[PDB]
Design an enzyme around this catalytic site. Sequence first.
Site, short mmCIF file in Angstrom:
data_model
loop_
_atom_site.label_atom_id
_atom_site.label_comp_id
_atom_site.label_asym_id
_atom_site.label_seq_id
_atom_site.Cartn_x
_atom_site.Cartn_y
_atom_site.Cartn_z
N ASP A 100 0.84 -1.19 0.00
CA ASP A 100 0.00 0.00 0.00
C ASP A 100 0.87 1.24 0.00
OD1 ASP A 100 -2.61 1.48 0.50
OD2 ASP A 100 -1.71 1.78 2.55
N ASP A 103 -0.30 4.89 1.07
CA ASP A 103 -0.48 5.92 2.10
C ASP A 103 -0.37 5.33 3.49
OD1 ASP A 103 -0.76 8.41 0.51
OD2 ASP A 103 -2.60 7.41 -0.21
MG LIG Z 1 -2.74 3.08 3.60
#
Ligand SMILES: [Mg+2]
Lengths: 168, 167
Positions: B8, B10
Amino acid sequence: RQRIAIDMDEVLADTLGAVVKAVNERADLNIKMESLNGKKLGLVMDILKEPGFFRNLDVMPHAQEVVKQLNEHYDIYIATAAMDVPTSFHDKYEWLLEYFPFLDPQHFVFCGRKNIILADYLIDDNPKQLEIFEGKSIMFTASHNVYEHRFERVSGWRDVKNYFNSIE
Amino acid sequence: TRQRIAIDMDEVLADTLGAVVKAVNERADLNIKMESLNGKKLGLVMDILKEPGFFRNLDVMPHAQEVVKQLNEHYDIYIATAAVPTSFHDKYEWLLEYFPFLDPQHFVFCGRKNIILADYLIDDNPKQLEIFEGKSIMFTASHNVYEHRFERVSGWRDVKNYFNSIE
Ligand SMILES: [Mg+2]
Ligand SMILES: [Cl-]
Ligand SMILES: [Cl-]
Ligand SMILES: [Mg+2]
Protein backbone atom coordinates in the site's frame (compact mmCIF):
# COMPACT_ATOMS: atom_id res chain seq x y z
CA ARG A 1 -19.65 -17.66 -6.82
CA GLN A 2 -16.88 -17.19 -9.30
CA ARG A 3 -15.25 -14.02 -10.59
CA ILE A 4 -14.75 -12.96 -14.23
CA ALA A 5 -12.29 -10.16 -15.04
CA ILE A 6 -12.96 -8.36 -18.33
CA ASP A 7 -10.53 -6.20 -20.30
CA MET A 8 -11.82 -2.94 -21.79
CA ASP A 9 -10.00 -2.09 -25.07
CA GLU A 10 -10.95 -4.28 -28.00
CA VAL A 11 -13.15 -6.37 -25.71
CA LEU A 12 -15.78 -4.11 -24.16
CA ALA A 13 -14.92 -0.92 -26.11
CA ASP A 14 -14.27 -0.62 -29.87
CA THR A 15 -10.96 1.09 -29.53
CA LEU A 16 -9.56 -0.04 -32.88
CA GLY A 17 -12.64 1.07 -34.87
CA ALA A 18 -12.28 4.52 -33.29
CA VAL A 19 -8.61 4.90 -34.14
CA VAL A 20 -8.98 3.71 -37.73
CA LYS A 21 -11.95 6.05 -38.25
CA ALA A 22 -9.98 9.02 -36.99
CA VAL A 23 -6.91 8.11 -39.05
CA ASN A 24 -9.06 7.72 -42.20
CA GLU A 25 -10.73 11.09 -41.64
CA ARG A 26 -7.57 13.03 -40.87
CA ALA A 27 -4.95 11.56 -43.20
CA ASP A 28 -7.62 10.90 -45.89
CA LEU A 29 -7.10 7.15 -46.06
CA ASN A 30 -9.26 4.06 -46.62
CA ILE A 31 -7.80 1.63 -44.12
CA LYS A 32 -9.94 -1.52 -44.06
CA MET A 33 -10.34 -3.53 -40.87
CA GLU A 34 -9.47 -6.83 -42.69
CA SER A 35 -6.03 -5.47 -43.63
CA LEU A 36 -5.07 -5.38 -39.93
CA ASN A 37 -5.38 -9.14 -39.41
CA GLY A 38 -2.34 -10.48 -37.54
CA LYS A 39 -0.94 -6.92 -37.45
CA LYS A 40 -0.93 -3.80 -35.33
CA LEU A 41 -2.15 -0.51 -36.86
CA GLY A 42 2.41 8.88 -34.73
CA LEU A 43 -0.94 10.48 -35.50
CA VAL A 44 -2.28 7.30 -33.85
CA MET A 45 -0.55 8.03 -30.58
CA ASP A 46 -1.84 11.59 -30.74
CA ILE A 47 -5.37 10.29 -31.43
CA LEU A 48 -5.20 8.01 -28.39
CA LYS A 49 -3.83 10.76 -26.13
CA GLU A 50 -6.52 13.36 -27.05
CA PRO A 51 -8.80 14.12 -24.08
CA GLY A 52 -12.17 12.45 -24.51
CA PHE A 53 -10.99 9.66 -26.83
CA PHE A 54 -11.76 6.87 -24.39
CA ARG A 55 -14.98 8.64 -23.35
CA ASN A 56 -16.51 8.42 -26.82
CA LEU A 57 -15.86 4.81 -27.78
CA ASP A 58 -18.63 2.48 -28.98
CA VAL A 59 -19.55 -0.56 -26.92
CA MET A 60 -18.87 -3.89 -28.60
CA PRO A 61 -22.00 -5.61 -29.93
CA HIS A 62 -24.01 -7.44 -27.27
CA ALA A 63 -21.51 -6.68 -24.47
CA GLN A 64 -23.99 -4.86 -22.20
CA GLU A 65 -26.70 -7.50 -22.43
CA VAL A 66 -24.26 -10.38 -21.97
CA VAL A 67 -22.31 -8.84 -19.07
CA LYS A 68 -25.61 -7.98 -17.34
CA GLN A 69 -26.59 -11.66 -17.69
CA LEU A 70 -23.22 -12.99 -16.47
CA ASN A 71 -23.52 -10.64 -13.46
CA GLU A 72 -26.54 -12.67 -12.21
CA HIS A 73 -24.25 -15.63 -11.47
CA TYR A 74 -20.67 -14.26 -11.52
CA ASP A 75 -18.91 -11.34 -9.81
CA ILE A 76 -17.68 -9.05 -12.55
CA TYR A 77 -14.48 -6.97 -12.51
CA ILE A 78 -13.21 -4.70 -15.27
CA ALA A 79 -9.51 -4.39 -15.74
CA THR A 80 -7.59 -1.95 -17.90
CA ALA A 81 -4.17 -0.35 -18.29
CA ALA A 82 -3.39 2.75 -16.29
CA MET A 83 0.16 3.62 -17.47
CA ASP A 84 -0.85 3.09 -21.06
CA VAL A 85 -2.15 6.59 -21.82
CA PRO A 86 -1.93 8.04 -18.24
CA THR A 87 -4.05 11.06 -19.16
CA SER A 88 -7.14 8.81 -20.01
CA PHE A 89 -7.48 7.25 -16.54
CA HIS A 90 -10.58 9.38 -15.78
CA ASP A 91 -12.26 9.02 -19.21
CA LYS A 92 -12.08 5.22 -19.03
CA TYR A 93 -13.69 5.22 -15.60
CA GLU A 94 -16.41 7.53 -16.79
CA TRP A 95 -17.07 5.35 -19.86
CA LEU A 96 -17.56 2.32 -17.58
CA LEU A 97 -19.97 4.25 -15.37
CA GLU A 98 -21.99 5.32 -18.42
CA TYR A 99 -22.22 1.98 -20.26
CA PHE A 100 -21.95 -0.52 -17.38
CA PRO A 101 -23.93 1.31 -14.68
CA PHE A 102 -25.16 -1.93 -13.08
CA LEU A 103 -21.65 -2.95 -12.03
CA ASP A 104 -20.16 -2.01 -8.70
CA PRO A 105 -17.68 0.86 -9.36
CA GLN A 106 -15.31 -0.67 -6.81
CA HIS A 107 -14.80 -3.58 -9.22
CA PHE A 108 -12.87 -1.40 -11.68
CA VAL A 109 -9.16 -2.03 -11.51
CA PHE A 110 -6.33 -0.25 -13.36
CA CYS A 111 -3.15 -2.29 -13.73
CA GLY A 112 -0.46 -3.23 -16.29
CA ARG A 113 0.11 -6.92 -15.92
CA LYS A 114 -3.08 -8.77 -15.21
CA ASN A 115 -1.38 -11.63 -13.40
CA ILE A 116 -2.04 -9.50 -10.30
CA ILE A 117 -5.75 -10.11 -10.71
CA LEU A 118 -7.39 -12.73 -8.47
CA ALA A 119 -10.28 -14.19 -10.59
CA ASP A 120 -11.45 -17.48 -12.04
CA TYR A 121 -11.67 -16.17 -15.64
CA LEU A 122 -10.08 -13.34 -17.72
CA ILE A 123 -11.59 -12.22 -21.04
CA ASP A 124 -8.83 -10.35 -22.89
CA ASP A 125 -7.65 -9.84 -26.45
CA ASN A 126 -3.86 -9.60 -25.61
CA PRO A 127 -2.01 -12.91 -25.65
CA LYS A 128 0.68 -11.42 -23.41
CA GLN A 129 -1.89 -11.00 -20.66
CA LEU A 130 -3.55 -14.33 -21.33
CA GLU A 131 -0.26 -16.11 -20.96
CA ILE A 132 0.46 -14.70 -17.48
CA PHE A 133 -3.05 -14.73 -15.96
CA GLU A 134 -3.41 -17.38 -13.21
CA GLY A 135 -7.06 -18.27 -13.74
CA LYS A 136 -8.69 -19.55 -16.92
CA SER A 137 -7.72 -17.35 -19.90
CA ILE A 138 -10.37 -16.68 -22.53
CA MET A 139 -9.18 -14.98 -25.72
CA PHE A 140 -11.60 -12.47 -27.22
CA THR A 141 -11.00 -12.25 -30.98
CA ALA A 142 -9.38 -9.06 -32.34
CA SER A 143 -7.71 -8.43 -35.68
CA HIS A 144 -4.23 -8.53 -34.14
CA ASN A 145 -4.70 -12.00 -32.50
CA VAL A 146 -6.49 -13.96 -35.24
CA TYR A 147 -3.43 -16.27 -35.77
CA GLU A 148 -2.87 -17.09 -32.03
CA HIS A 149 -3.82 -20.66 -31.10
CA ARG A 150 -2.79 -21.28 -27.46
CA PHE A 151 -5.99 -20.11 -25.72
CA GLU A 152 -9.63 -20.91 -25.62
CA ARG A 153 -11.14 -18.48 -28.16
CA VAL A 154 -14.40 -16.55 -28.20
CA SER A 155 -15.34 -14.47 -31.22
CA GLY A 156 -17.84 -11.89 -29.95
CA TRP A 157 -20.10 -11.52 -26.92
CA ARG A 158 -22.60 -14.17 -28.08
CA ASP A 159 -19.65 -16.62 -28.06
CA VAL A 160 -18.90 -15.48 -24.53
CA LYS A 161 -22.47 -16.27 -23.36
CA ASN A 162 -22.35 -19.65 -25.06
CA TYR A 163 -18.99 -20.49 -23.36
CA PHE A 164 -20.32 -19.76 -19.91
CA ASN A 165 -23.64 -21.53 -20.64
CA SER A 166 -21.66 -24.69 -21.63
CA ILE A 167 -19.72 -24.98 -18.35
CA GLU A 168 -22.87 -24.38 -16.28
CA THR B 1 8.89 -18.74 -9.57
CA ARG B 2 8.95 -15.64 -7.36
CA GLN B 3 6.47 -14.99 -4.67
CA ARG B 4 4.74 -11.61 -4.74
CA ILE B 5 4.32 -8.79 -2.23
CA ALA B 6 1.65 -6.13 -2.67
CA ILE B 7 2.45 -2.86 -0.78
CA ASP B 8 0.00 0.00 0.00
CA MET B 9 1.09 3.63 -0.48
CA ASP B 10 -0.48 5.92 2.10
CA GLU B 11 0.84 5.53 5.65
CA VAL B 12 3.08 2.62 4.44
CA LEU B 13 5.45 3.70 1.71
CA ALA B 14 4.61 7.41 2.03
CA ASP B 15 4.33 9.48 5.20
CA THR B 16 0.88 10.83 4.38
CA LEU B 17 -0.13 11.57 7.97
CA GLY B 18 3.06 13.55 8.70
CA ALA B 19 2.29 15.73 5.72
CA VAL B 20 -1.31 16.37 6.64
CA VAL B 21 -0.48 17.15 10.28
CA LYS B 22 2.24 19.55 9.17
CA ALA B 23 -0.12 21.35 6.79
CA VAL B 24 -2.91 21.55 9.36
CA ASN B 25 -0.47 22.90 11.98
CA GLU B 26 0.84 25.60 9.58
CA ARG B 27 -2.58 26.72 8.37
CA ALA B 28 -4.78 26.51 11.43
CA ASP B 29 -1.74 27.56 13.52
CA LEU B 30 -2.21 24.38 15.64
CA ASN B 31 0.27 22.00 17.22
CA ILE B 32 -1.56 18.68 16.93
CA LYS B 33 0.49 15.88 18.45
CA MET B 34 0.68 12.37 17.01
CA GLU B 35 0.23 10.97 20.54
CA SER B 36 -3.21 12.62 20.44
CA LEU B 37 -4.02 10.63 17.26
CA ASN B 38 -3.78 7.10 18.68
CA GLY B 39 -6.79 5.15 17.49
CA LYS B 40 -7.92 8.15 15.43
CA LYS B 41 -8.05 9.03 11.68
CA LEU B 42 -8.14 12.94 11.72
CA GLY B 43 -13.22 20.29 5.77
CA LEU B 44 -9.63 21.49 5.27
CA VAL B 45 -8.03 18.04 5.57
CA MET B 46 -9.91 17.09 2.38
CA ASP B 47 -8.79 20.40 0.93
CA ILE B 48 -5.15 19.69 1.78
CA LEU B 49 -5.42 16.18 0.34
CA LYS B 50 -7.03 17.35 -2.88
CA GLU B 51 -4.48 20.14 -3.65
CA PRO B 52 -2.52 19.23 -6.83
CA GLY B 53 0.97 18.15 -5.85
CA PHE B 54 0.04 16.91 -2.34
CA PHE B 55 0.94 13.29 -3.04
CA ARG B 56 3.94 14.31 -5.13
CA ASN B 57 5.57 16.02 -2.16
CA LEU B 58 5.24 13.25 0.49
CA ASP B 59 8.30 12.01 2.37
CA VAL B 60 9.22 8.37 1.97
CA MET B 61 8.70 6.25 5.11
CA PRO B 62 12.04 5.62 6.78
CA HIS B 63 14.08 2.80 5.17
CA ALA B 64 11.32 1.97 2.67
CA GLN B 65 13.51 2.44 -0.44
CA GLU B 66 16.25 0.17 0.96
CA VAL B 67 14.00 -2.56 2.30
CA VAL B 68 11.70 -2.68 -0.75
CA LYS B 69 14.77 -2.87 -3.04
CA GLN B 70 16.14 -5.78 -0.97
CA LEU B 71 12.73 -7.52 -0.99
CA ASN B 72 12.68 -7.05 -4.79
CA GLU B 73 15.78 -9.32 -5.02
CA HIS B 74 13.55 -12.26 -4.04
CA TYR B 75 9.95 -11.22 -4.54
CA ASP B 76 8.02 -9.50 -7.27
CA ILE B 77 6.75 -6.19 -5.89
CA TYR B 78 3.36 -4.67 -6.72
CA ILE B 79 2.17 -1.28 -5.46
CA ALA B 80 -1.53 -0.96 -4.68
CA THR B 81 -3.39 2.34 -4.06
CA ALA B 82 -6.72 4.09 -4.56
CA ALA B 83 -6.42 7.22 -6.71
CA VAL B 84 -8.74 12.46 -6.03
CA PRO B 85 -8.40 14.32 -9.39
CA THR B 86 -4.59 14.81 -9.77
CA SER B 87 -3.71 12.04 -7.31
CA PHE B 88 -3.19 9.32 -9.92
CA HIS B 89 -0.57 11.38 -11.73
CA ASP B 90 1.10 12.59 -8.54
CA LYS B 91 1.30 9.07 -7.06
CA TYR B 92 2.81 7.51 -10.17
CA GLU B 93 5.36 10.27 -10.52
CA TRP B 94 6.27 9.86 -6.87
CA LEU B 95 6.86 6.11 -7.41
CA LEU B 96 8.91 6.77 -10.50
CA GLU B 97 11.05 9.21 -8.54
CA TYR B 98 11.53 7.38 -5.27
CA PHE B 99 11.18 3.74 -6.36
CA PRO B 100 12.69 3.71 -9.85
CA PHE B 101 13.67 0.00 -9.53
CA LEU B 102 10.06 -1.02 -9.40
CA ASP B 103 8.22 -1.88 -12.57
CA PRO B 104 5.31 0.51 -13.40
CA GLN B 105 3.49 -2.43 -14.94
CA HIS B 106 3.15 -3.56 -11.33
CA PHE B 107 1.27 -0.42 -10.19
CA VAL B 108 -2.31 -1.25 -9.29
CA PHE B 109 -5.06 1.32 -8.82
CA CYS B 110 -8.10 -0.30 -7.13
CA GLY B 111 -10.46 0.43 -4.26
CA ARG B 112 -10.68 -2.97 -2.57
CA LYS B 113 -7.61 -5.08 -2.45
CA ASN B 114 -9.54 -8.46 -2.37
CA ILE B 115 -8.81 -8.36 -6.17
CA ILE B 116 -5.09 -8.69 -5.71
CA LEU B 117 -3.43 -12.09 -6.20
CA ALA B 118 -0.29 -11.97 -4.06
CA ASP B 119 1.39 -14.01 -1.32
CA TYR B 120 1.53 -10.96 0.99
CA LEU B 121 -0.05 -7.55 1.43
CA ILE B 122 1.58 -4.87 3.56
CA ASP B 123 -1.17 -2.33 4.42
CA ASP B 124 -2.19 -0.10 7.33
CA ASN B 125 -5.96 -0.45 6.85
CA PRO B 126 -7.52 -3.39 8.72
CA LYS B 127 -10.55 -3.27 6.36
CA GLN B 128 -8.22 -4.12 3.39
CA LEU B 129 -6.28 -6.67 5.47
CA GLU B 130 -9.49 -8.52 6.36
CA ILE B 131 -10.53 -9.03 2.72
CA PHE B 132 -7.04 -9.80 1.23
CA GLU B 133 -6.72 -13.53 0.35
CA GLY B 134 -2.96 -13.77 0.85
CA LYS B 135 -1.01 -13.28 4.06
CA SER B 136 -2.06 -9.87 5.52
CA ILE B 137 0.80 -7.93 7.16
CA MET B 138 -0.36 -4.89 9.21
CA PHE B 139 1.95 -1.88 8.99
CA THR B 140 1.66 0.19 12.15
CA ALA B 141 -0.12 3.52 11.97
CA SER B 142 -1.71 5.75 14.65
CA HIS B 143 -5.22 4.78 13.64
CA ASN B 144 -4.63 0.94 13.91
CA VAL B 145 -2.82 0.61 17.21
CA TYR B 146 -5.73 -1.29 18.88
CA GLU B 147 -6.19 -3.77 16.04
CA HIS B 148 -4.90 -7.23 16.97
CA ARG B 149 -6.11 -9.69 14.36
CA PHE B 150 -3.20 -9.39 11.95
CA GLU B 151 0.52 -9.96 12.10
CA ARG B 152 2.03 -6.50 12.98
CA VAL B 153 5.18 -4.83 11.65
CA SER B 154 6.29 -1.47 13.02
CA GLY B 155 8.42 0.25 10.41
CA TRP B 156 10.38 -1.00 7.40
CA ARG B 157 13.36 -2.50 9.34
CA ASP B 158 10.69 -4.55 11.13
CA VAL B 159 9.27 -5.60 7.74
CA LYS B 160 12.81 -6.75 6.81
CA ASN B 161 13.07 -8.66 10.07
CA TYR B 162 9.75 -10.35 9.29
CA PHE B 163 10.83 -11.56 5.84
CA ASN B 164 14.26 -12.57 7.14
CA SER B 165 12.61 -14.75 9.79
CA ILE B 166 10.65 -16.74 7.27
CA GLU B 167 13.73 -17.36 5.02
MG1 LIG C 1 -2.74 3.08 3.60
CL1 LIG D 1 -10.81 7.60 -11.55
CL1 LIG E 1 0.51 -19.06 -15.90
MG1 LIG F 1 -7.58 -5.18 -24.82
